[PDB]
Paper text:
Here, we determine the high-resolution structures of cyclic di-pyrimidine-synthesizing cGAS/DncV-like nucleotidyltransferases (CD-NTases) in clade E (CdnE) in its apo, substrate-, and intermediate-bound states. Based on sequence conservation and structural similarity, it is proposed that the cyclic di-pyrimidine-synthesizing CdnE proteins, including ClCdnE, EfCdnE, and LpCdnE, form smaller donor pockets that act as molecular gauges to recognize and retain the binding of pyrimidine nucleotides but weaken or exclude the binding to purine nucleotides.
By including substrate UTP or UMPnPP and cofactor MgCl2 in the crystallization solutions, we obtained the complex crystals of ClCdnE-UTP, LpCdnE-UTP, and LpCdnE-UMPnPP and refined them to 2.6-Å, 1.95-Å and 2.2-Å resolution, respectively. In addition to the Mg-B ion, the α-phosphate of the donor UTP also forms a coordinate bond with a Mg ion, Mg-A, which further shares the Asp67 side-chain and a water molecule with Mg-B in octahedral-complex formation. The other ligands are the Asp139 side-chain, the ribose O3’ of the acceptor nucleotide, and a water molecule. Besides the bond of O3’ to Mg-A, the acceptor ribose has O2’ hydrogen bonded to the Asp67 side-chain.
Numbering used by the authors: 2 to 87, 96 to 300
The structure:
Amino acid sequence: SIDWEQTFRKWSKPSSETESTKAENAERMIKAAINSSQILSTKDISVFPQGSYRNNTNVREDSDVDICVCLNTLVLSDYSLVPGMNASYTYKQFKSDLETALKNKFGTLGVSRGDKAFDVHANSYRVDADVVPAIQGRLYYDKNHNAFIRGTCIKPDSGGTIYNWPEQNYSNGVNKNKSTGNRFKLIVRAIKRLRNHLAEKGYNTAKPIPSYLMECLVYIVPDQYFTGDSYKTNVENCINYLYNQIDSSDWTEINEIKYLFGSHQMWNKTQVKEFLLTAWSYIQKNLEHHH
Ligand SMILES: O=c1ccn([C@@H]2O[C@H](COP(=O)(O)OP(=O)(O)OP(=O)(O)O)[C@@H](O)[C@H]2O)c(=O)[nH]1
Ligand SMILES: [Mg+2]
Ligand SMILES: [Mg+2]
């Protein structure tokens, strides 16, 4: 007998009241690591927060701050939408120099290299951050030199190319929060805590559902479903809409550029539907049946 209205209202809160301070500190310290690097301080590099701290969708106190370190002067362009359309400092050298800069500022005990990002955990600066090296990415929509959208590009150690759209994610999230009178991100956080709750209780359908996927999914739900004074009704509306529309959908991420499903993603629609069914059952009272 969970009071789901009061539970979702509680779970709609930020991870803490000091999120902005944690994110500011992470960003400042990563910039300081760059500035103290002889090689990197001479480069056109942007350091910025992304992820749930930047978007105010974080719910875990122990979430690492996501920091992007972007070398703006290396460009990778996607020409796939335009019929017929087609340096000395490399991404690999950049990533190695970034690893060295982070080890120099925070110590080797505070830095590990993953496939995509560096894990920085340095009690001395109170920094817990996932620091990803990126370059400028572009998606062309016409053959003219100016006809592109700008984002970031990641080149993992294991190969391949990842396009990200952090500024577009942030702006569209802000706009939807405005259009819903702040209910959008409240419900994102409520649903992220619901997922974490189910995963901690051993529900296997909740385990392959990542935070960013849920943020994208809730963004997809039309604004009308966020109205009213019942957070429980909002959450139910989200589950209902998503479950009944996902099969025929061709949805994008919150940036409205990248497709939410496909071979470029680690999640699929079947996982999402199974999680939605689990969440729908768990939220009900006095259910006598189980499948
Ligand atoms: O599969 C992914 C994962 C991550 N990302 C991009 O990297 C950002 C940081 O990756 P995170 O996994 O940390 O997601 P998050 O910050 O939104 O959620 P929590 O930490 O609160 O769990 C994400 O918000 C997303 O923008 C993707 O584009 N695709
Ligand atoms: Mg994060
Ligand atoms: Mg992260």
